[PDB]
Write a protein that binds this ligand. Structure first.
Ligand SMILES: Nc1ncnc2c1ncn2[C@@H]1O[C@H](COP(=O)(O)OP(=O)(O)NP(=O)(O)O)[C@@H](O)[C@H]1O
Ligand SMILES: [Mg+2]
Length: 324
C-alpha cells in the first residue's frame, strides 16, 4: 500500500507569455499551490496541497528557487532508493504543452540544467560503483521508446522504421515486442544512448510520449551454497506529450485511468500508453507524478485542469511488494 507521490513545478514565463504581458497567477508556500483566476479576480483563489512544490518561476539567484539538482535530490533520489530496495518505480511528467515536462525529465545536457533522467542514471552508476561488498554484482539494461499516435518506435534502434507491437505476455504482462534492451556498464555509455535516443525523436507542440526504462538487477551471492538470489526493479521514467483522434487517445485515456483509480473496470487497454504503464498506475510500483505548470494568466484553464488531475493522482494507492 503506497500512494502515488505528486509534485507540481511552475516555470519562468516563456516568449508567448511575456509578449502578452502575462501576470503570474500561481503562488506557492510550503506544500500549498494557489491559482488566481485572472478572469474572475474577486472569486476565491483555488488552493491545492501536494507532496512537493517546486517554485522554478524565477532563477537560481533566488533563494527559494527549485533547481534541477534540487528537484532530483528530492523526488528523484527517493524513487531511486525504492529501486535499490527492490521496488518497481515510475516517474512521469504531466502537463500543458510547453509547461516544462521535458526540461524537468531531460533538461539540457549542458552546464547545470540536467533533468531527473540523466541525474538518476549518474546517481545509479555512482552508487553501484561505490559498492564494497564483493558478494554483490549488478546489471543495468536500458530501453527507450516513443509513443506517437498509438504507435511505438524504438529510439535506440533508428535503423528500424517499423512500429513495434505492444503485446500482453500470457503470464508476465505488457511488453513491446522486439524493443531493444541494451546492457550498459557505465554512466557514460547509458548517457550516449540517451543522447542518441533524444536526437532520433520527432522531429513546436509534441504529441508523442517518451518512455525511458531501466532494468536494474541486483545479484547477491551467498557463500556456502552457490545460488545467487536476484533482485529486479524496473525503473520507468516517462515524458508525456502535453495536454490541450488517434494522436490523443493515450493522453485522454490516462486521464480516465487516473480518475477511475482515484474513484476506487478500467480502460487500461484503451491505449498503448496506459496498457504498458498498467502496473505503474494501479499495480506493484512506487509511482510519482511531476505536474508541470505554466505561471501565466493566459493559461488559467489548462493549468487548473493540470492541478485537478494531479490532485486526483494523489488519491491513487498501489499495493507494493519487493521483488526478491
Ligand atoms: N524550470 C525551468 N527553468 C527554465 N526553463 C524552463 C523550466 N521549465 C521549462 N523551461 C523552458 O520552457 C520550455 C518548456 O519546455 P519543455 O520544452 O520543457 O516543455 P513540455 O516539455 O512542457 N512541452 P511539450 O513537449 O511541447 O508538450 C522550454 O523552452 C524549457 O527550456
Ligand atoms: Mg516535452
Amino acid at each position: 500500500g503506497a500512494s502515488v507521490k505528486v509534485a507540481v513545478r511552475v516555470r519562468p514565463f516563456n516568449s508567448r507569455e511575456m509578449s502578452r504581458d502575462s501576470k503570474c497567477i500561481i503562488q506557492m508556500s510550503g506544500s500549498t499551490t494557489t491559482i488566481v483566476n485572472p478572469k474572475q479576480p474577486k472569486e476565491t483563489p483555488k488552493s491545492f496541497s501536494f507532496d512537493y512544490s517546486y517554485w522554478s518561476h524565477t532563477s537560481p539567484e533566488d533563494i527559494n528557487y527549485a533547481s534541477q539538482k534540487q528537484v532530483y535530490r528530492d523526488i528523484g533520489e527517493e524513487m531511486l532508493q525504492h529501486a535499490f530496495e527492490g521496488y518497481n518505480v515510475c516517474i512521469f511528467a504531466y502537463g500543458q504543452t510547453g509547461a516544462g515536462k521535458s526540461y524537468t525529465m531531460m533538461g539540457k545536457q549542458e552546464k547545470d540544467q540536467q533533468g531527473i533522467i540523466p541525474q538518476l542514471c549518474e546517481d545509479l552508476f555512482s552508487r553501484i560503483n561505490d559498492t564494497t561488498n564483493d558478494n554483490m554484482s549488478y546489471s543495468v539494461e536500458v530501453s527507450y521508446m516513443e509513443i506517437y499516435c498509438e504507435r511505438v518506435r524504438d529510439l535506440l534502434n533508428p535503423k528500424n522504421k517499423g512500429n513495434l507491437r505492444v503485446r500482453e505476455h500470457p503470464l508476465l504482462g505488457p511488453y513491446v515486442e522486439d524493443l531493444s534492451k541494451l546492457a550498459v556498464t557505465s554512466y557514460n555509455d547509458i548517457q550516449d544512448l540517451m543522447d542518441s535516443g533524444n536526437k532520433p525523436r520527432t522531429v513546436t507542440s509534441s504529441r508523442s510520449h517518451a518512455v525511458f526504462n531501466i532494468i536494474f538487477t541486483q545479484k547477491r551471492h551467498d557463500a556456502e551454497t552457490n545460488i545467487t538470489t536476484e533482485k529486479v526493479s524496473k525503473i520507468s521514467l516517462v515524458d508525456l506529450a502535453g495536454s490541450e483522434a488517434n494522436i490523443n487517445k493515450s493522453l485522454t485515456t490516462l486521464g480516465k485511468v487516473i480518475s477511475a483509480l482515484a474513484e476506487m473496470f478500467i480502460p487500461y487497454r484503451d491505449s498503448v500508453l496506459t496498457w504498458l504503464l498498467r502496473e505503474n498506475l494501479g499495480g506493484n510500483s512506487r509511482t510519482a507524478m511531476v505536474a508541470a505548470l505554466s505561471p501565466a494568466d493566459i493559461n488559467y484553464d489548462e493549468t487548473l485542469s493540470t492541478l485537478r488531475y494531479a490532485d486526483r493522482a494523489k488519491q491513487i494507492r498501489n499495493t507494493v511488494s519487493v521483488n526478491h
